[PDB]
């Protein structure tokens, strides 16, 4: 009756693979994965039961995982996992559907990975095969991903874009505003579509319904419309400007900065608009990446706003730019925590962006060197420290460009900034 004595011990730990009975749980498992390593193990265990639907969904999941690591370089495990998913796509290159191809391209484009030119042609052939019969079955979300996904990959095949545009043309009037905005972004980015019938049709389709555009899409539409149609043949730019004036206070900081710069390019800026922008930008200057800081400086400078005692916006922007370049935010947090050995990831800005910012500050008209405490002093001080560690990247032309900026601001003695 009794053949073993004692309390039952722990069960043995056994390595197992996915069984055929649970083939329908693969999509759920992909969603539940919380890291690249976990997703790698999920795919490995299910290797014998992988299908094109699973391969496409995994690449889309890379975008979700990478989002949690914003502000840092793409992690090594993500890159290694992407190197394996690419091989699977090659095997199933001709078995994907139009909806699945859109997911695959978006995921790989978000990770900033360049797909091989031969794979793009094979993937492109799938979309436009059979006279675009399957394009009539792709929904709005599929179309949006196809346009932006292929554009972000640098695809420059004239025939592919010609056929794709023809199939989508009759459906534009029924797409949502956000989808139409993405189409305009692609059209403006492709030179050979600048003055086609498809380009005009897109503008005419967007004008009737503009109240549904989101802040981010609204800013892009205004940018693209201004570039494509300098003269208001269609009542689009005028309508977009009216919306900007009415709801200027409601939009987020990033979109307001971008839209303001577009108005200055359009030469419709007024002193009243410049005055109203300053209090909002000064308060939320810390919520603008380096790219948006450059837009803010150019827009305000073009508008003609001058530094005021109450709101010295230029001084605030210079400090904010220095923090982003130096990446002091991570160090500041570690100081409060008490552990200064904390790893700090960063995305170094390109030298080209540094030159553009330096020229804009020089054109601002403020000094940095002469005075002990000048508004632009911290930015140039940070620039010198950064360039000291990037001398290898420095070139003769780059040195001359910086030297001109240094001379304009008032530092030409070959000495480090006071601060």
């Amino acid at each position: 009756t009794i053949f073993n004595t004692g309390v039952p011990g722990p069960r043995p730990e056994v390595a197992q693979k996915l069984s055929t009975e649970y083939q329908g749980h693969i999509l759920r498992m992909i969603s539940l994965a919380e890291s690249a390593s976990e997703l790698d193990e999920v795919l490995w265990s299910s290797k014998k039961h992988l299908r094109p639907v699973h391969i496409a969904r995994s690449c889309l999941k890379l975008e979700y995982l990478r989002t949690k690591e914003k502000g840092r370089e793409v992690s090594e495990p993500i890159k290694n996992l992407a190197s394996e998913l690419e091989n699977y796509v090659e095997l199933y290159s001709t078995k994907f559907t139009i909806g699945q191809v859109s997911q695959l391209v978006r995921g790989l484009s978000s990770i900033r990975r360049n797909i091989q030119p031969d794979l793009l042609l094979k993937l492109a052939a799938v979309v436009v095969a059979d006279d675009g019969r399957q394009v009539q079955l792709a929904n709005e979300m599929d179309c949006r991903d196809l346009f932006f996904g292929f554009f972000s990959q640098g695809f420059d095949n004239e025939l592919f874009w010609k056929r794709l545009s023809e199939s989508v043309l009759p459906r534009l009037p029924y797409f949502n505003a956000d989808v139409v905005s993405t189409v305009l972004r692609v059209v403006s980015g492709l030179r050979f579509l600048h003055n086609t019938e498809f380009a005009h049709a897109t503008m005419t389709a967007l004008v009737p319904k503009v109240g549904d555009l989101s802040p981010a899409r609204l800013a892009d539409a205004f940018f693209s419309a201004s570039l494509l149609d300098p003269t208001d043949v269609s009542g689009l730019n005028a309508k977009l400007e009216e919306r900007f004036l009415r709801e200027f206070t409601s939009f987020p900081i990033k979109d307001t900065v971008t839209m303001f710069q577009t108005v200055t390019v359009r030469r419709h800026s007024t002193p009243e608009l410049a005055a109203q922008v300053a209090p909002l930008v000064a308060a939320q200057a810390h919520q603008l990446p380096v790219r948006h800081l450059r837009r803010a400086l150019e827009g305000m400078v073009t508008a003609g706003w001058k530094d005021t005692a109450e709101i010295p916006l230029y001084a605030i922007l210079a400090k904010q730019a220095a923090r982003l370049v130096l990446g002091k935010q991570s160090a500041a947090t570690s100081a409060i925590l008490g552990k200064h050995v904390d790893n700090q990831g960063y995305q170094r800005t390109p030298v080209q962006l540094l030159r553009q910012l330096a020229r804009i500050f020089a054109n601002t008209g403020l000094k940095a060197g002469p005075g002990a405490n000048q508004p632009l002093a911290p930015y140039f001080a940070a620039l010198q420290r950064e360039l000291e560690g990037r001398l290898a990247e420095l070139d003769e032309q780059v040195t001359d460009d910086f030297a001109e900026s240094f001379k304009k601001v008032g530092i030409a003695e070959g000495a480090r900034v006071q601060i």
Partner: protein
């Protein structure tokens, strides 16, 4: 204990431990085995690589019209559909159902294990690189009915399940890799006219 009623002792003990844990907090708050538990891995040893094999069969074209075949003086051994065949031109073989091919198409077989003539023999270990066999697809058919019957005497058990297997038929056209012995060359046209439709 003599009673056959299932015992409720485990239920009574669980109710007591749950009540104590609910009301009385524990003193310890960590477990070292949990703290240093490492990431899950697939295995503790390197994976074993697979051995490559030549392609089984691939289409190369179609047949345009009626043709004739003559006898040659070479033969070979080819692996196909899980079994091996000894073939010479103008032979007919029967295999399991092959997917992805159509009647009046020409296929290429590359898993060649042995080539022979009347003056030389070539042995593959286990396959001969640079040899192939050509064949024409002639039929996709259902074979004769096989009647499957089971019964158990005196147990009221009886089952009947007829079935029809699926198979494919091929005709061998050419064997490439070994030259005929001197004086055994076929000096006249032998095969059909093939429209090549597979360029890689």
């Amino acid at each position: 204990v003599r009673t056959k009623l299932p015992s409720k002792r485990p239920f009574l003990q669980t109710a007591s431990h749950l009540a104590v844990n609910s009301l009385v907090p524990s003193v310890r708050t960590n477990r070292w085995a949990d703290l240093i538990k490492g990431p899950a891995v697939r295995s503790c040893i390197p994976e074993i690589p697979e051995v490559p094999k030549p392609s089984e069969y691939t289409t190369i074209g179609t047949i345009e019209g009626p043709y004739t075949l003559n006898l040659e003086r070479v033969f070979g051994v080819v692996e196909l559909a899980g079994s091996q065949y000894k073939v010479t031109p103008d032979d007919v073989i029967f295999t399991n159902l092959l997917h992805g091919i159509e009647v009046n198409e020409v296929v290429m077989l590359e898993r060649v294990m042995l080539l022979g003539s009347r003056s030389n023999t070539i042995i593959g270990r286990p396959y001969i690189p640079g040899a192939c066999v050509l064949a024409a697809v002639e039929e996709h058919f259902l074979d004769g009915t096989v009647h499957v019957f089971k019964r158990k005497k005196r147990k009221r058990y009886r089952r009947y399940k007829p079935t029809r297997p699926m198979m494919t038929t091929l005709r061998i056209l050419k064997v490439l890799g070994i030259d005929p012995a001197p004086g055994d060359e076929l000096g006249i046209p032998s095969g059909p006219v093939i429209k090549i439709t597979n360029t890689e």
